Amino acid sequence: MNTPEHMTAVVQRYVAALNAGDLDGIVALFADDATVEEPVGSEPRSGTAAIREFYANSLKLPLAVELTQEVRAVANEAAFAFTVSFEYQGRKTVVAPINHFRFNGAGKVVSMRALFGEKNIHAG
Amino acid sequence: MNTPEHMTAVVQRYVAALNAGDLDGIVALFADDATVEEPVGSEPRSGTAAIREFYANSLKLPLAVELTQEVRAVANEAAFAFTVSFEYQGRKTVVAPINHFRFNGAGKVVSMRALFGEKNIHAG
């Protein structure tokens, strides 16, 4: 099993890499065969290439990401609440998802699911 | 597909039924083939009898439960952050999970998974 300390450090590093626009640092947290489903209910992206492209695309505008409560981490999984803020054409948006990671035996993320709907998308 | 507003009202009903110690009102939110897994990594309880027993066990102590952020709801799923406190012989414990619900076509909860570990629990 993963330790909660490792899974919590990863979640913190994810947030910091998003804030830094550090694309390589984000992708390095994932397994080679990982999948990302964001938002929940959309079609999943699988493998390094598609995941790197997903994050490259999510970083087209500067993002401010804040973890907004403690990380929950138990049994090879972690969940966390956060916000992502950005501005486009003079309009600010703040999105507030809950993300879920599952980790493999080597401590890499094998699955990310980002759960948020239209009610979790707010004005800046 | 479920509505985010139906899912959100069920999360609030759940929380309200826990606070009132209303065992029937909790179990009525679940499908008769639902599974509950709390904490994540423990053996899942499946079906009405086991789900009623699971909540009867939770309700052996008085609970104070409150949502601590807005509910996330999309597709057929919801996730929520909350705290639960309870007291046994004058000693109080507070726990901060993130729960995830999946709902069926009829709007009942077909699966609840509760993520938290010892780092999210504070006794006395």
XYZ file of C-alpha atoms in Angstrom:
248
model
C 0.000 0.000 0.000
C 0.825 3.758 -0.505
C 1.303 5.859 2.583
C -1.137 8.777 3.198
C 1.920 11.061 3.527
C 3.092 10.147 -0.045
C -0.435 10.568 -1.540
C -0.836 13.904 0.262
C 2.604 15.158 -0.975
C 1.557 14.233 -4.530
C -1.682 16.183 -4.286
C 0.305 19.203 -2.996
C 2.871 18.825 -5.759
C 0.033 18.607 -8.366
C -1.434 21.902 -7.132
C 1.992 23.565 -7.095
C 2.859 22.305 -10.589
C -0.474 23.603 -11.945
C 0.295 27.026 -10.368
C 3.781 27.059 -11.859
C 2.563 25.981 -15.360
C 4.995 23.044 -14.842
C 3.701 20.603 -17.428
C 6.483 18.005 -17.019
C 6.062 18.080 -13.250
C 2.349 17.281 -13.564
C 2.778 14.483 -16.081
C 5.597 12.885 -13.964
C 2.982 12.168 -11.196
C 1.017 9.811 -13.448
C 1.562 6.209 -14.439
C 2.273 5.463 -18.173
C -1.181 3.823 -18.497
C -3.062 6.326 -16.293
C -6.501 7.706 -17.204
C -7.967 11.195 -16.549
C -11.711 11.859 -16.590
C -12.518 15.551 -16.193
C -15.246 16.412 -15.668
C -16.791 13.157 -14.408
C -19.156 11.806 -17.022
C -16.957 12.946 -19.956
C -14.909 10.452 -22.042
C -11.610 9.441 -20.289
C -8.133 10.272 -21.777
C -5.668 7.383 -21.347
C -1.842 7.146 -21.439
C 0.982 9.672 -21.165
C 0.512 11.377 -24.566
C -3.163 12.104 -24.130
C -2.610 13.153 -20.475
C 0.244 15.483 -21.356
C -1.983 16.996 -24.083
C -4.892 17.349 -21.657
C -2.789 19.297 -19.151
C -1.066 21.386 -21.876
C -4.479 22.416 -22.999
C -5.676 23.152 -19.388
C -2.703 25.493 -19.010
C -3.483 27.663 -22.064
C -4.514 30.529 -19.620
C -2.640 31.340 -16.321
C -4.354 29.371 -13.449
C -4.449 30.098 -9.713
C -5.088 26.729 -7.970
C -5.758 26.601 -4.194
C -6.282 23.504 -2.059
C -9.248 24.534 0.074
C -9.314 21.858 2.831
C -7.121 19.018 4.070
C -6.418 16.138 1.783
C -8.250 12.867 2.503
C -5.998 9.814 1.845
C -6.514 6.185 2.730
C -5.877 2.785 1.002
C -4.178 3.822 -2.305
C -6.644 6.693 -2.880
C -6.855 10.400 -2.138
C -9.595 12.961 -2.535
C -9.299 16.737 -2.317
C -11.253 19.974 -2.655
C -9.736 22.926 -4.444
C -10.495 25.869 -6.673
C -9.116 26.844 -10.085
C -9.342 30.539 -11.022
C -8.638 32.085 -14.435
C -9.742 35.041 -16.576
C -10.784 35.104 -20.234
C -11.801 38.182 -22.221
C -12.164 40.271 -19.088
C -14.310 37.642 -17.247
C -13.066 35.793 -14.217
C -14.137 32.270 -13.415
C -13.575 30.189 -10.283
C -14.240 26.439 -10.649
C -14.566 24.298 -7.380
C -14.140 20.585 -8.011
C -13.540 17.612 -5.820
C -10.814 15.439 -7.368
C -10.188 11.752 -6.700
C -6.787 10.061 -7.355
C -6.093 6.355 -7.266
C -2.440 5.292 -6.888
C -0.566 2.212 -8.053
C 2.014 0.138 -6.166
C 4.852 2.374 -7.422
C 3.150 5.497 -5.966
C 2.076 6.977 -9.313
C -1.442 8.191 -10.076
C -3.241 5.631 -12.230
C -6.610 7.331 -12.287
C -7.805 10.909 -11.825
C -11.557 11.824 -11.716
C -12.525 15.507 -11.326
C -16.110 15.876 -10.090
C -17.818 19.303 -10.601
C -20.895 20.561 -12.430
C -22.268 23.881 -13.590
C -23.273 24.720 -9.984
C -19.584 24.566 -8.990
C -18.496 27.185 -11.530
C -18.595 30.715 -10.123
C -17.805 34.374 -10.993
C -14.478 35.753 -9.880
C -29.566 11.038 -16.303
C -29.955 12.406 -12.710
C -30.208 16.133 -12.128
C -27.489 17.876 -10.095
C -30.247 19.434 -7.972
C -31.866 16.008 -7.153
C -28.410 14.657 -6.181
C -27.652 17.665 -4.067
C -30.990 17.422 -2.220
C -30.319 13.720 -1.517
C -26.836 14.642 0.010
C -28.611 17.205 2.202
C -31.338 14.672 3.164
C -28.599 12.180 4.075
C -26.842 14.648 6.315
C -30.235 15.676 7.861
C -31.219 12.005 8.542
C -27.810 11.324 10.202
C -28.306 14.367 12.523
C -31.819 13.218 13.452
C -30.758 9.601 14.014
C -33.416 8.642 11.396
C -32.311 5.145 10.264
C -35.274 4.568 7.887
C -34.803 7.963 6.214
C -31.150 7.166 5.547
C -31.756 3.708 4.155
C -34.675 4.948 1.981
C -32.110 7.070 -0.042
C -30.322 3.898 -1.262
C -31.243 1.393 -4.010
C -32.022 -2.075 -2.730
C -28.840 -3.239 -4.525
C -26.607 -0.368 -3.217
C -23.080 -0.831 -1.748
C -21.497 1.274 0.994
C -17.773 1.326 1.512
C -16.633 3.393 4.539
C -13.671 3.948 4.828
C -12.445 3.241 1.344
C -10.312 0.044 1.504
C -12.675 -1.659 4.046
C -15.038 -4.513 3.015
C -18.030 -3.047 1.106
C -21.473 -3.700 2.597
C -23.982 -4.648 -0.103
C -27.742 -4.749 -0.049
C -30.511 -3.473 2.194
C -29.907 -5.708 5.231
C -26.201 -4.959 5.415
C -26.797 -1.233 4.696
C -29.400 -0.966 7.491
C -27.012 -2.815 9.906
C -24.099 -0.466 8.858
C -26.132 2.673 9.709
C -27.663 1.156 12.809
C -24.019 0.721 13.976
C -23.114 4.359 13.071
C -26.159 5.583 15.013
C -25.201 3.867 18.286
C -23.657 7.260 19.155
C -25.279 10.762 18.757
C -23.794 12.380 15.579
C -23.457 16.079 14.598
C -22.885 16.180 10.863
C -22.445 19.303 8.684
C -21.556 20.013 5.078
C -18.476 22.178 4.977
C -18.520 23.173 1.338
C -20.970 23.148 -1.605
C -21.900 19.713 -3.044
C -20.286 18.740 -6.337
C -22.749 17.047 -8.629
C -22.471 16.005 -12.294
C -23.488 13.115 -14.572
C -24.825 10.547 -12.154
C -22.481 11.276 -9.260
C -21.989 13.583 -6.316
C -19.078 14.274 -3.965
C -19.200 16.235 -0.701
C -16.924 17.431 2.088
C -18.289 17.399 5.608
C -17.507 16.758 9.256
C -19.021 14.335 11.656
C -18.507 14.573 15.356
C -19.525 12.100 18.002
C -18.993 11.610 21.690
C -18.559 8.515 23.787
C -18.320 8.869 27.610
C -17.495 12.500 27.540
C -14.757 12.166 24.872
C -15.487 13.760 21.458
C -13.965 12.738 18.115
C -14.312 14.812 14.916
C -13.885 13.232 11.469
C -13.614 15.070 8.108
C -14.399 12.793 5.154
C -15.099 13.334 1.499
C -17.901 11.027 0.349
C -18.793 10.096 -3.205
C -22.262 8.895 -4.267
C -23.247 7.225 -7.545
C -26.954 7.313 -8.370
C -29.124 4.976 -10.468
C -31.693 5.941 -13.188
C -34.409 5.989 -10.458
C -32.439 8.653 -8.396
C -31.440 6.301 -5.566
C -27.880 5.965 -4.301
C -26.356 2.861 -5.680
C -22.878 3.364 -4.184
C -21.267 5.429 -1.440
C -17.530 5.418 -0.870
C -16.139 7.453 2.081
C -12.599 8.639 1.896
C -10.729 9.698 5.059
C -7.840 8.343 7.167
C -6.424 8.918 10.676
C -5.023 12.294 9.566
C -8.620 13.426 9.065
C -9.745 12.286 12.556
C -9.134 14.161 15.810
C -10.092 12.468 19.074
C -10.544 14.290 22.417
